[PDB]
Amino acid sequence: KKVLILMSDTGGGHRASAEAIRAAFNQEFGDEYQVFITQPDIIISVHPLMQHVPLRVLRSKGLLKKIVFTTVITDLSTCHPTWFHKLVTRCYCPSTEVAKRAQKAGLETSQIKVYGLPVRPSFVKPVRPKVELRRELGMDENLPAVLLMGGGEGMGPIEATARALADALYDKNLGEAVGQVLIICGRNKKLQSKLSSLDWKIPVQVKGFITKMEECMGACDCIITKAGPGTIAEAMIRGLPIILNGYIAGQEAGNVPYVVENGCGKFSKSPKEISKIVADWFGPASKELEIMSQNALRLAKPEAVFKIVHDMHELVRKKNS
Ligand SMILES: O=c1ccn([C@@H]2O[C@H](COP(=O)(O)OP(=O)(O)O)[C@@H](O)[C@H]2O)c(=O)[nH]1
C-alpha cells in the first residue's frame, strides 16, 4: 500500500515526525506498506497548512472516500487552528490540551486521538544504566550532566551557555567540577570545531550529529534546548527536565507553556541565568530536579508513533472495505 506524508521542508517540516512515522511503518508492517515523504491509500499531514488545500483536492474529485486523510499535530499547546479540519478522518493529538482544543474546533470524538507526539521507534528502545552510557560517551561517570543542544542545525547561544556552565559548575573550594556538559551540535560543523578546540575547566564532550539520541539523553540529568517539539517529547521520555532557551518564531511558541505549566522545566533566554538554574538543580535544588523528572516521565508518550500508525492501518483496512 502507498503512504504519502507531506510537509514543508521550508524549515518547519516537521521532518522529525515524518521520518519517525515512516520508520514506524517499516518496522511494524514490513513491506506491506510503502511510504514517501513530501497513488496513496493513506495520506498524512504533519504541517499546519497542508490540511485545507490537500483536502479540497480530494473533495473536488471524490477521491476522499477512497483514501484516508489524517493529521499529526506538532505543536504541544495553544495551537494554530489550521491543524483542525472537520473533513479529517483522524487528528492525532500530542496532548489533552490540544484534544480539548480540537473539540472546540468541532472535531467529533471519533475524529480525535491523543497518542502523543510521534517519536522515532529507534529512540524508544528502553533505558541503559547511566554509568554505562556515560562511559561510552567519554563523560565522567559520577558527575551530574546537562545536555546542551539546538535541534539538527545547532542553533542558539550554545557557546555562551557552555562558557557560563563551565564557570557555574566549578566548585572553587574543592578546586573541582560539580557538574559536566554534553554538547550536541548536530550539523553545525563550525560550532563543533570551535567548541572542541577550547579547554574547558569542567568535563565537556562536544559531538556533531547524533543518531542515538536515546543514549545521549539517557546519560544526562537535564537538558538545555530551543523549544523544538521533537526534542521536548524525546526529553520527557528520558525523564529530562527541560530548560527552554528560546523558540523559532511562530513554529515553536506554543510549546513553552506545555513544558512550564506541566512542571517539566523552565524558560530563560539568558546563558548566565540558565547556568544558574543548572547549578541549582545539581546542588541545593536537587529535590526539585527529581520532581520535574517524574513529571516528565508521567507525561512521556513513548509508544506514540506505534499507536498512531496502527490506527492508520486499521483505517485503510476499512476504507478499501
Ligand atoms: O545531533 C542531532 C541533533 C538533532 N537530532 C534530532 O533532531 C530532531 C529535532 O527536532 P525538533 O522538533 O526538536 O527541532 P526542529 O525540527 O523544529 O528543528 C530531534 O528529534 C533530535 O533528536 C538528532 O537526532 N541528532
Coordinates of C-alpha atoms and ligand atoms in Angstrom, one line a residue:
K1 CA 0.0 0.0 0.0
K2 CA 1.0 3.6 -0.6
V3 CA 1.7 6.0 2.3
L4 CA 2.1 9.7 1.4
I5 CA 3.4 12.1 4.0
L6 CA 3.6 15.8 3.2
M7 CA 5.5 18.5 5.0
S8 CA 7.1 21.9 4.4
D9 CA 10.8 21.4 4.5
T10 CA 10.9 25.2 4.4
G11 CA 12.1 24.8 7.9
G12 CA 9.1 23.8 9.8
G13 CA 8.6 20.3 8.4
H14 CA 8.1 18.5 10.7
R15 CA 10.8 16.2 9.2
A16 CA 11.5 14.6 12.6
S17 CA 7.9 13.4 12.8
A18 CA 7.7 12.3 9.1
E19 CA 10.7 10.1 9.4
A20 CA 9.7 8.8 12.7
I21 CA 6.3 7.7 11.2
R22 CA 8.0 6.1 8.2
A23 CA 10.3 4.3 10.5
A24 CA 7.2 3.1 12.4
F25 CA 5.6 1.7 9.2
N26 CA 8.7 -0.2 8.0
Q27 CA 9.3 -1.7 11.5
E28 CA 5.7 -2.7 12.1
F29 CA 4.1 -3.9 8.8
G30 CA 7.3 -4.5 6.8
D31 CA 6.9 -4.2 3.1
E32 CA 3.1 -4.4 3.5
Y33 CA 3.3 -0.6 3.2
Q34 CA 5.4 1.7 1.0
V35 CA 5.8 5.3 2.3
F36 CA 7.0 8.5 0.7
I37 CA 7.8 11.9 2.4
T38 CA 7.0 15.1 0.7
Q39 CA -1.1 6.6 -5.7
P40 CA -1.7 6.8 -1.9
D41 CA -4.2 4.8 0.2
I42 CA -3.5 6.8 3.4
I43 CA -2.4 10.4 3.5
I44 CA -0.7 12.0 6.5
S45 CA -0.1 15.7 7.1
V46 CA 2.5 16.8 9.7
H47 CA 2.0 20.5 9.0
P48 CA -0.5 23.3 9.9
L49 CA -1.0 24.5 6.3
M50 CA -1.4 21.2 4.4
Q51 CA -4.9 20.4 5.5
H52 CA -7.5 22.5 3.7
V53 CA -6.0 22.6 0.3
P54 CA -4.9 18.9 0.2
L55 CA -8.4 18.1 1.3
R56 CA -10.2 20.2 -1.3
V57 CA -8.2 18.2 -3.8
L58 CA -9.9 15.1 -2.5
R59 CA -13.4 16.7 -2.3
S60 CA -13.5 18.2 -5.7
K61 CA -12.6 14.8 -7.3
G62 CA -14.4 12.5 -4.9
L63 CA -11.2 10.6 -4.1
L64 CA -11.9 11.3 -0.4
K65 CA -14.0 8.2 0.5
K66 CA -11.2 6.3 -1.3
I67 CA -8.1 7.4 0.5
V68 CA -7.8 8.2 4.2
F69 CA -6.7 11.7 5.3
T70 CA -5.1 12.0 8.7
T71 CA -3.2 14.7 10.6
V72 CA -0.4 14.6 13.2
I73 CA -0.3 17.8 15.2
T74 CA 3.2 19.0 16.2
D75 CA 2.5 22.0 18.5
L76 CA 2.0 21.0 22.1
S77 CA -0.2 23.8 23.3
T78 CA -2.0 26.9 22.2
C79 CA -2.1 25.7 18.6
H80 CA -2.9 27.4 15.3
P81 CA -6.5 26.4 14.4
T82 CA -5.3 25.4 10.9
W83 CA -4.4 21.9 12.3
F84 CA -8.1 21.2 12.7
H85 CA -10.4 20.3 9.9
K86 CA -13.8 18.6 10.1
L87 CA -13.2 16.6 6.9
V88 CA -10.3 14.9 8.6
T89 CA -10.7 11.2 9.3
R90 CA -8.4 11.4 12.3
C91 CA -6.4 14.1 14.0
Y92 CA -3.7 12.9 16.3
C93 CA -3.1 15.0 19.2
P94 CA 0.0 15.2 21.3
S95 CA -1.8 16.3 24.5
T96 CA -5.2 16.7 26.2
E97 CA -4.8 20.4 25.9
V98 CA -4.9 20.1 22.2
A99 CA -7.5 17.4 22.1
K100 CA -9.9 19.5 24.2
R101 CA -8.9 22.3 21.7
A102 CA -9.9 20.1 18.7
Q103 CA -13.3 19.5 20.4
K104 CA -13.8 23.3 20.4
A105 CA -12.9 23.2 16.7
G106 CA -15.9 20.9 16.3
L107 CA -14.0 17.7 15.6
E108 CA -16.1 14.8 16.8
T109 CA -14.7 12.3 19.3
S110 CA -14.3 9.7 16.6
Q111 CA -12.1 12.2 14.8
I112 CA -9.6 12.7 17.6
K113 CA -6.8 10.6 19.0
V114 CA -4.4 11.5 21.9
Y115 CA -1.5 9.2 21.5
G116 CA 1.2 11.9 21.9
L117 CA 3.8 13.4 19.7
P118 CA 5.3 10.6 17.4
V119 CA 8.9 9.8 18.4
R120 CA 11.4 7.6 16.4
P121 CA 10.9 3.9 17.2
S122 CA 14.7 3.9 17.2
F123 CA 14.5 6.2 20.1
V124 CA 12.1 4.3 22.3
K125 CA 14.0 1.2 23.0
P126 CA 14.5 1.2 26.7
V127 CA 16.9 2.6 29.3
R128 CA 20.5 1.6 29.8
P129 CA 22.3 2.4 33.1
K130 CA 23.6 5.9 33.3
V131 CA 27.1 4.9 34.3
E132 CA 27.5 2.8 31.2
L133 CA 26.1 5.4 28.8
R134 CA 28.5 8.0 30.2
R135 CA 31.5 5.7 29.9
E136 CA 30.6 5.0 26.2
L137 CA 30.5 8.8 25.5
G138 CA 33.7 9.6 27.4
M139 CA 31.8 11.5 30.1
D140 CA 32.7 11.4 33.8
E141 CA 30.7 8.6 35.4
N142 CA 29.5 10.3 38.6
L143 CA 29.1 14.0 37.8
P144 CA 25.6 15.2 37.0
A145 CA 25.4 16.1 33.4
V146 CA 23.5 18.7 31.4
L147 CA 22.7 18.1 27.7
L148 CA 23.1 21.2 25.6
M149 CA 21.8 21.3 22.0
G150 CA 19.7 23.2 19.4
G151 CA 18.0 20.9 17.0
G152 CA 19.5 19.4 13.9
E153 CA 21.4 22.6 12.9
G154 CA 22.8 23.6 16.3
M155 CA 21.0 26.9 16.8
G156 CA 21.0 29.0 20.0
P157 CA 23.7 30.8 22.0
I158 CA 25.4 27.4 22.6
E159 CA 29.0 28.6 23.2
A160 CA 27.9 31.5 25.5
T161 CA 25.9 29.0 27.5
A162 CA 28.7 26.4 27.6
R163 CA 31.0 29.0 29.0
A164 CA 28.5 30.1 31.6
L165 CA 28.0 26.5 32.6
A166 CA 31.8 25.9 32.9
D167 CA 32.1 28.7 35.4
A168 CA 28.9 27.9 37.2
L169 CA 29.5 24.2 37.7
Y170 CA 33.1 24.5 39.1
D171 CA 33.5 24.4 42.9
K172 CA 36.4 26.7 43.7
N173 CA 36.7 25.5 47.3
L174 CA 37.4 21.9 46.3
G175 CA 39.0 23.0 43.1
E176 CA 36.9 20.6 41.0
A177 CA 33.8 20.2 38.9
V178 CA 30.4 19.6 40.4
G179 CA 28.8 19.1 37.0
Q180 CA 29.6 18.3 33.4
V181 CA 28.2 19.0 29.9
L182 CA 27.4 17.1 26.8
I183 CA 27.0 19.3 23.8
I184 CA 25.4 18.1 20.6
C185 CA 26.0 20.5 17.7
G186 CA 24.0 18.5 15.1
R187 CA 25.2 19.5 11.7
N188 CA 26.7 22.8 12.9
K189 CA 30.3 21.8 12.0
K190 CA 31.7 25.3 12.5
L191 CA 30.4 25.4 16.1
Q192 CA 31.6 21.8 16.7
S193 CA 35.2 22.7 15.9
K194 CA 35.1 26.0 17.8
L195 CA 33.9 24.3 21.0
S196 CA 36.2 21.3 20.5
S197 CA 39.3 23.5 20.3
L198 CA 38.7 25.2 23.6
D199 CA 40.0 24.0 27.0
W200 CA 37.1 23.6 29.4
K201 CA 37.6 23.5 33.2
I202 CA 34.8 21.0 33.7
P203 CA 34.3 17.8 31.7
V204 CA 32.8 18.8 28.3
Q205 CA 32.1 16.5 25.5
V206 CA 31.4 18.0 22.0
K207 CA 29.6 15.9 19.5
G208 CA 28.4 16.6 16.0
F209 CA 25.3 14.8 14.6
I210 CA 24.0 12.1 16.9
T211 CA 21.7 9.3 15.7
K212 CA 21.4 7.5 19.0
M213 CA 19.9 10.5 20.9
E214 CA 18.3 8.0 23.2
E215 CA 21.7 7.2 24.7
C216 CA 22.9 10.8 24.9
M217 CA 19.7 11.8 26.8
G218 CA 20.0 8.7 28.9
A219 CA 23.4 9.8 30.1
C220 CA 22.2 13.2 31.3
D221 CA 20.2 14.7 34.1
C222 CA 18.6 17.7 32.4
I223 CA 18.6 19.5 29.0
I224 CA 19.0 22.9 27.5
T225 CA 17.4 23.4 24.1
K226 CA 15.3 25.6 21.9
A227 CA 11.6 24.7 22.1
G228 CA 11.6 22.1 19.3
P229 CA 8.6 19.7 19.8
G230 CA 10.6 16.6 18.8
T231 CA 13.4 17.3 21.4
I232 CA 10.8 18.2 24.0
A233 CA 9.0 14.9 23.6
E234 CA 12.2 13.0 23.5
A235 CA 13.5 14.7 26.6
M236 CA 10.3 13.8 28.5
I237 CA 10.5 10.1 27.5
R238 CA 14.0 10.2 29.1
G239 CA 12.8 12.0 32.2
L240 CA 14.9 15.0 31.4
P241 CA 13.8 18.3 33.0
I242 CA 14.0 21.0 30.3
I243 CA 15.4 24.4 30.3
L244 CA 14.0 26.1 27.2
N245 CA 16.3 28.9 26.0
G246 CA 14.1 30.2 23.2
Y247 CA 12.0 29.2 20.2
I248 CA 11.6 29.7 16.5
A249 CA 9.1 32.5 15.8
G250 CA 5.6 31.2 15.0
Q251 CA 6.6 27.5 14.8
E252 CA 7.6 26.8 18.4
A253 CA 6.0 29.4 20.6
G254 CA 3.1 27.3 21.8
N255 CA 5.5 24.6 23.2
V256 CA 6.8 26.8 26.0
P257 CA 3.7 26.7 28.2
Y258 CA 3.4 22.9 27.7
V259 CA 6.8 22.4 29.5
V260 CA 6.4 25.1 32.1
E261 CA 2.8 24.7 33.0
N262 CA 3.2 20.9 33.4
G263 CA 6.1 21.2 35.8
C264 CA 8.6 19.7 33.3
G265 CA 11.0 22.7 33.1
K266 CA 11.7 26.4 32.9
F267 CA 12.2 29.1 30.3
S268 CA 15.1 31.6 30.2
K269 CA 17.0 33.3 27.3
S270 CA 20.0 34.3 29.4
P271 CA 23.0 31.9 29.2
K272 CA 24.0 33.1 32.7
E273 CA 20.6 32.5 34.3
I274 CA 20.4 29.1 32.6
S275 CA 23.7 28.1 34.1
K276 CA 22.4 29.3 37.5
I277 CA 19.4 27.0 37.2
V278 CA 21.6 24.0 36.3
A279 CA 24.0 24.7 39.2
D280 CA 20.9 25.0 41.4
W281 CA 19.4 21.7 40.2
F282 CA 22.8 19.9 40.5
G283 CA 23.2 21.3 44.0
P284 CA 20.8 22.7 46.7
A285 CA 17.7 22.2 44.5
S286 CA 18.2 18.6 43.6
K287 CA 14.8 17.7 45.0
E288 CA 13.1 20.0 42.5
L289 CA 15.0 18.3 39.7
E290 CA 13.7 14.9 40.6
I291 CA 10.1 16.1 40.8
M292 CA 10.4 17.7 37.4
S293 CA 12.0 14.5 36.1
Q294 CA 9.0 12.5 37.5
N295 CA 6.6 15.0 35.9
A296 CA 8.3 14.5 32.6
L297 CA 8.0 10.7 32.8
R298 CA 4.3 10.8 33.7
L299 CA 3.7 12.9 30.5
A300 CA 6.0 10.9 28.3
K301 CA 4.4 9.1 25.4
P302 CA 7.0 6.6 24.1
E303 CA 4.6 4.4 22.2
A304 CA 3.0 7.4 20.4
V305 CA 4.2 6.6 16.9
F306 CA 3.2 3.0 17.1
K307 CA -0.4 3.6 18.2
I308 CA -0.7 6.3 15.5
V309 CA 0.3 4.1 12.5
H310 CA -1.6 1.0 13.8
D311 CA -4.6 3.2 14.0
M312 CA -3.7 4.3 10.5
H313 CA -3.6 0.7 9.5
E314 CA -7.0 -0.2 10.9
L315 CA -8.2 2.8 8.9
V316 CA -7.1 1.8 5.4
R317 CA -8.1 -1.8 6.1
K318 CA -11.6 -0.4 6.3
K319 CA -11.8 2.3 3.6
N320 CA -10.9 -0.2 0.9
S321 CA -13.5 -2.3 2.6
Ligands
LIG1 O1 22.6 15.8 16.5 C1 21.4 15.7 16.5 C2 20.6 16.8 16.5 C3 19.2 16.7 16.4 N1 18.6 15.4 16.3 C4 17.2 15.3 16.3 O2 16.6 16.3 15.5 C5 15.3 16.5 15.9 C6 14.9 17.9 16.1 O3 13.6 18.1 16.2 P1 12.9 19.4 16.9 O4 11.5 19.4 16.8 O5 13.3 19.4 18.3 O6 13.6 20.7 16.2 P2 13.1 21.2 14.7 O7 12.8 20.0 13.9 O8 12.0 22.0 14.9 O9 14.2 21.9 14.1 C7 15.1 15.7 17.3 O10 14.3 14.6 17.2 C8 16.5 15.3 17.6 O11 16.6 14.1 18.3 C9 19.4 14.3 16.3 O12 18.9 13.2 16.2 N2 20.8 14.4 16.4

